[model samples]
Target: IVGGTASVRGEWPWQVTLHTTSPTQRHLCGGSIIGNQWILTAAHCFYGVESPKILRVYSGILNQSEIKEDTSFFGVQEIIIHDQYKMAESGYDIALLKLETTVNYTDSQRPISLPSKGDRNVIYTDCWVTGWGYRKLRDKIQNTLQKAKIPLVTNEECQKRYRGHKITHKMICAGYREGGKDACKGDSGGPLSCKHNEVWHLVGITSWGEGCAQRERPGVYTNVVEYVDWILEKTQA
Candidate 1:
C-alpha cells in the first residue's frame, strides 16, 4: 500500500489528517486518532523554532482533493511536544495534538488502537506507515495518502546507521538497505502501525529520513512506546 485510497491502499480505519496554519502558510500532515480527542503526530510538525496559532484537523480523509476544499474543520486547542525533543539531533521528535472538540466516529473517521504498557517486546517488529507524503521529487506533496511496510531496526543497528547522533530511547528507527520503499518527507507525524492481538497499534510517528527514497538511508520514526507516560502526563496537564 504505497499510496492510500479505498481501492488502492486499502482501508485505514484509524488515520486522520492534520491541517496546520502557520503565520505564512497552511500545510498538512498525517496523524492517528488515538482517542476521542487525541491525535499523535511528530513534535516537529507543531514546534518549529516557535509555536503555531491554529491547527485545523480533518478526519475521514485519504484524498487530498476532498480535504483541500472541505469546509468542515476541527480546531486544534493545544499542541504538546515532548520536553526532551531536540531539533538539532531529532531526538524525541514526537508530539500529541489535542482537539477542542470530540470527533463523531463514523465509517470515514475512527480512532486507532495504542499498544499496552510493558509490551516493548514488539520492538524491531514489522509494521506499516501511512501518509500523504512526497513519493518523488516531481511529485511534491502527495495528493493521496500513502502506505508502506517497514521493519523496526534494533537500537544497535539504529546507532550504527547514524553514528554519533545518539539514538535515544525516545526514538525508533526503521528502513531497508536497497531502499525502494520507506517513508518520505511530508510524511512526518504519520502513524507507524503494527498489528498485535488482532488489533493495530501505533508504535511510532514518521519523523525524518536521510533523503527521499535513498538506499541504506531508510526512514526514521519517533518511538511512541517510550513516551507513553509523558503523553499521559502532558495531555492531562
Candidate 2:
C-alpha cells in the first residue's frame, strides 16, 4: 500500500489474505469475504494453478504476525477462476473460492456489501482500500494491514491516462491523479470499496496497474458491478 498508513484492527473486516500452503505458507494475494462460505478474489492469482488444495485463507486479523496464534485460516475447498481470464492483463480477473469450512463472522471478519446487478456507474465516494501488501515496490512488507483514501477514476479518464492499455467497462481505476497512493505488490485481489447511498459497496477488485503510486497510472480493479450476477450465481449454487 504505497503512500498509505497502517490500518487499525477491525477497520476493514471483509479483507482477507490468500496464502499457499504447499512448499511453505506465504502471502499470495488479498481477497474479500462475499459470503460465509465463499471468497472473492482475482483469477490471475491462480494462474496456471492445478488445484484448490494449495490455497489457504487468513481472516479476522489485521496483523500478519498474528496469523499463527489467531487460527483464522481455512483450507480452500473449491476454486472457480473466471473462464475468460486467459492472461494477467485480459480483464476478466475475478474468481471465487469456497472455504473448506464456513466463515464465522465477527467485528473483525464479515462479508462486504456487493453492488447490485443494476448499480452501475454511480461515481461512488469516500473510496478506500486496504491490504497486507508491501509498502513499496521491493521494500519491507507490511505487518498490520495498510489503508488509504484514494480518489476514484472514471473509465474514460483512466483510458486517457493509460493510452496504450485496454480499459474495459468491467474495470475501474483509483488513485490520485498527481500520484502517491495505491495498492502495490502483494495487494492484488483485494477490495476497492466505496460509500454509495450510505452503504459501502465493493466497487472494485485490485487487478493491475503500471506501477505503485505512479503519476497518472492509478490501480486498476475488476469492476464488481459487472460481475454481481455471476458472483451471486456461484455463491448460491
Candidate 3:
C-alpha cells in the first residue's frame, strides 16, 4: 500500500482477503471483519502455517479477479495465533480466524468496530490504511484495494526511528516522516482504520515494516486497542 490509491468498492467494508492454497491461489494476508465468525489478522500471517485447512476468506471483493454474489468465501475454522506470538520478536502480533461459514453482510460486507475500553488510549491523527499490499518495492500484488492516509507515530517517535527494532507495548506506529506512505508486502494482516465519534475504529494490525515507503521506517501495527480484551476473550466463546 505504499503511497496508496485504488480502493473504493464499498470504500472499506471490513476488508479482508487472506487466501492461500499452498503455491496456487495465493494472496497471503490482510484481514479484518471483526466477526460474523470473526477474523482479525497477523500472527505473522500464519508463520510456519499448520492447518486451517489451506485457508481462504475473501469477502466483498474490490477486485481480486472479481467474484460477486456478495463475494464472501470463508473457510478456516479456528486459528487463534498470539499466545505471545514471536517470530524473532515483534511482540504478540495478533490473529484470530475462526470462520467456517457465517458472513453474509453486504453493501460490500461489514463488521469492524472494536476499540472501546475507553477507546484504548485514543490517539488518532485521522487514520486510514487498507490493503492488497505492495504497489511498490518488489511490487505486484494489487488487483485493486489499496489506501493510505497514515499518521500516528509516537512511542518516542517510533523508538527513535526503530533504532534497535523492538518497538513494543503491543506495537502501533504509522507513516510519513519524509517517507512516502506505508504498509507493504501483501500488507500483512491489514486494516488500520480510525475515525472515532463518527464511528470507525479498529486501529492498526498491519504489523512490521522497514522498507516500502521508508524514510524513517514507519509501519508496524498490531495495536488494535491493545487486543481488546484478547479480542473479547477469543470471539466471545
Best by TM-score: 2
Off by over 4 Å in 2: none
Error of 3 at 203 (Å): 21
Write down the lDDT that model 1 would get.
0.72
**Tens-digit lDDT track for model 2 on 46-80?**
86456789888888878888878447588898999
Q: Write the per-residue lDDT of candidate 1 for residues 1-237, one digit (tens) a residue.
A: 233333243367677777766654355677888877788888777655244345778776667777655457677777877787767255778777788898888767787776677786566355888877777645676666777778777767777768747777767777766666777667778888998767788888888766666666656777777778887787677
**Over the stretch 40-61, how does candidate 3's per-residue lDDT look in tens digits?**
9888888857789888888888
lDDT of each: 0.72, 0.87, 0.84
Sort all candidates by TM-score, best to worst: 2, 1, 3
How do the predictions measure up, each by TM-score? Answer: 0.87, 0.95, 0.34
**What TM-score does candidate 3 get on C-alpha atoms?**
0.34
- Looking at model 1, the pairs that clash are 4-145
Q: Clashing residue pairs in candidate 3, if any?
A: 35-38
Best to worst by lDDT, what's the order? 2, 3, 1
- Which residue pairs in candidate 2 collide? none
* C-alpha root-mean-square deviation, candidate 1: 2.7
